[PDB]
Structure formats: C-alpha cells, structure tokens
Design a protein around this ligand. Structure first.
Ligand SMILES: Cc1cn([C@H]2C[C@H](n3cc(COc4ccc(S(N)(=O)=O)cc4)nn3)[C@@H](CO)O2)c(=O)[nH]c1=O
Ligand SMILES: [Zn+2]
Length: 258
C-alpha cells in the first residue's frame, strides 16, 4: 500500500507515512501575485545548459524523469536567490487528466495543464542524497505548461514515451537539450519549500517562472497515455500526478520583476 495519486493513497493520505506533509515549508503553494513582493536585490537567473548530457528516461510509476550526468558542472543553475552552484540531475512533469488542471503551483488560484520541474542539487553537499538533507540542498526551476501551439523542443520527449509506458521501464535518451523547454523570459517567483512527492523533504529553493510555455493538445495527450502500473498489471493511466497547493504558513514569496 505505497503512496500515489489514487483515492486510497493520494496526497490526503501521505502524512501517515510522511508526517512532514503537515510541515512548515511544504510545496506546492498558490502564488498570490498581488502579495508577492518585488525584491530588487534578487539577481537574474543564470541557466547554463549548453554542456548538458542527458542519459536516460525512466517511468518511475509517479512521472517520467529525463536524467542527466551530474558528475561534473555541465548543466548548472546559479544566481537569482541562490548562493553557489546547483547541478541539473533530472527533469520531469506533473499533468492533469484535463487541460484545466495538472500544475502543482497555482497563480492567483489558476491551474495550468502541466508543470515542468528541472531539479538541481547544491554542489557544496557533494551528491543529491546528501543535498536533500539540507534546507538549501535543491533548487527546482518550475515552468508552467498551457495548451496551444506545440513546443518543438518537447517533441523528442513525447516520441520516446511509447517505449517507457509502464513503471520501471527506461530507455536511452542522449543528446536532449533542455534549453528547448524554456520560455523567453526568466522572470520568476521564489520561496523556500519542499519536494512535492514523498519523502516531502524541506530542502528546496523554488524558482517558478512567470511565463508559461505552450505545448499542443497532441503533446499533452501523449503524456496521458503513460501508465502508473507495471507491465502485466491492470492499466491505470498516469494522469493527475500533482499535489495540490499547501498552506503558505510563515513564508513570503518574492518576485524578480515589477
Ligand atoms: C538519476 C539519479 C538518481 N539517483 C537517486 C536519487 C533519486 N531520488 C529522487 C528522489 C526524490 O526527488 C525529488 C522528488 C520530488 C521533486 S519535485 N516534484 O520537483 O519537488 C524533486 C526531486 N529521491 N531520490 C533516486 C531515484 O531516481 O535515485 C542518483 O543517486 N543518481 C542519479 O544519477
Ligand atoms: Zn515535480
């Protein structure tokens, strides 16, 4: 009886195995745009992905992860609210059964069709497993997806999903350039939070871009053909793999922009 996104194991149950689910800095949150404060001391984000080395794509039963070589500074996030250098380890998405839901963060209560998470760990902690034990261990760059025009840079991801339909399947996924998933603007909101899946560790500096990317209806429809189940198990479509907004508690969301 493992955590998931079903009626019997979804977000409202997670606190029983992961009591930090009710903690002081949980994610995601609603971003109230009128209450977020412009912080003129925030720096431009530095996204340095030119030397990124993607390796593999994995269906882990919760989402699919595009994994990177993080054994050198090849794809790094710096600047913005961050002190030091954060290395890209993987990206994944959360998405809905319907275009009207799927994001984890919301903006003035608006839900997007999906949300991209580019996950980075602080190199001062040596590896990802040590980093998640620290309050400044991770930086997750979140990008909203809306349905409209296709995102050309997403199509290579979409087209490999048939090969990783079920939980535990992986495929080679080299030479994928994550720069093709970014919007034009790097304006962002930032706040201290958590992983949005178990173990829900309070180790993340969230950086959520204001500008969504557009993906086509056909691209998100292919996300919704994935399965939560393993091969040889009853088919359950991988949809609505998002945690809803959590209480903001004693936090301020800062804006990089007026
Ligand atoms: C590719 C790779 C993996 N691993 C280890 C660490 C991996 N892992 C991931 C997690 C949970 O992390 C999360 C949860 C939520 C978010 S969210 N939604 O953005 O908030 C973000 C990150 N916990 N452990 C584990 C399974 O992949 O295998 C490795 O050691 N080396 C590698 O090269
Ligand atoms: Zn995520």
């Amino acid at each position: 009886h493992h955590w998931g996104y079903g009626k019997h194991n979804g977000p409202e149950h997670w606190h029983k195995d992961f009591p930090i689910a009710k903690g002081e800095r949980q994610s995601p949150v609603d971003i109230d745009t009128h209450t977020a404060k412009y912080d003129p001391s925030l720096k431009p984000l530095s996204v340095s992905y030119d030397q990124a080395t993607s390796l593999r794509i994995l269906n882990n039963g919760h989402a699919f992860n595009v994994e990177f070589d993080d054994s050198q500074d090849k794809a790094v996030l710096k600047g913005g609210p961050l002190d030091g250098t954060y290395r890209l380890i993987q990206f994944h998405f959360h998405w809905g059964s319907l275009d009207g839901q799927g994001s984890e963060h919301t903006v003035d209560k608006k839900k997007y069709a999906a949300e991209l998470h580019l996950v980075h760990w602080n190199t001062k902690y040596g590896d990802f497993g040590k980093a998640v034990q620290q309050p400044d261990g991770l930086a997750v760059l979140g990008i909203f997806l809306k349905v409209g025009s296709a995102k050309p840079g997403l199509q290579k991801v979409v087209d490999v999903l048939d090969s990783i339909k079920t939980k535990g399947k992986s495929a080679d996924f080299t030479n994928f350039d994550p720069r093709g998933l970014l919007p034009e603007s790097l304006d962002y909101w930032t706040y201290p939070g958590s992983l949005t899946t178990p173990p829900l560790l309070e180790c993340v500096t969230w950086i959520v871009l204001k500008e969504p990317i557009s993906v086509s209806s056909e691209q998100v429809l292919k996300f919704r053909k994935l399965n939560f189940n393993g091969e040889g198990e009853p088919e359950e479509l991988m949809v609505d793999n998002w945690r809803p907004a959590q209480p903001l508690k004693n936090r301020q969301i800062k804006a990089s922009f007026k």
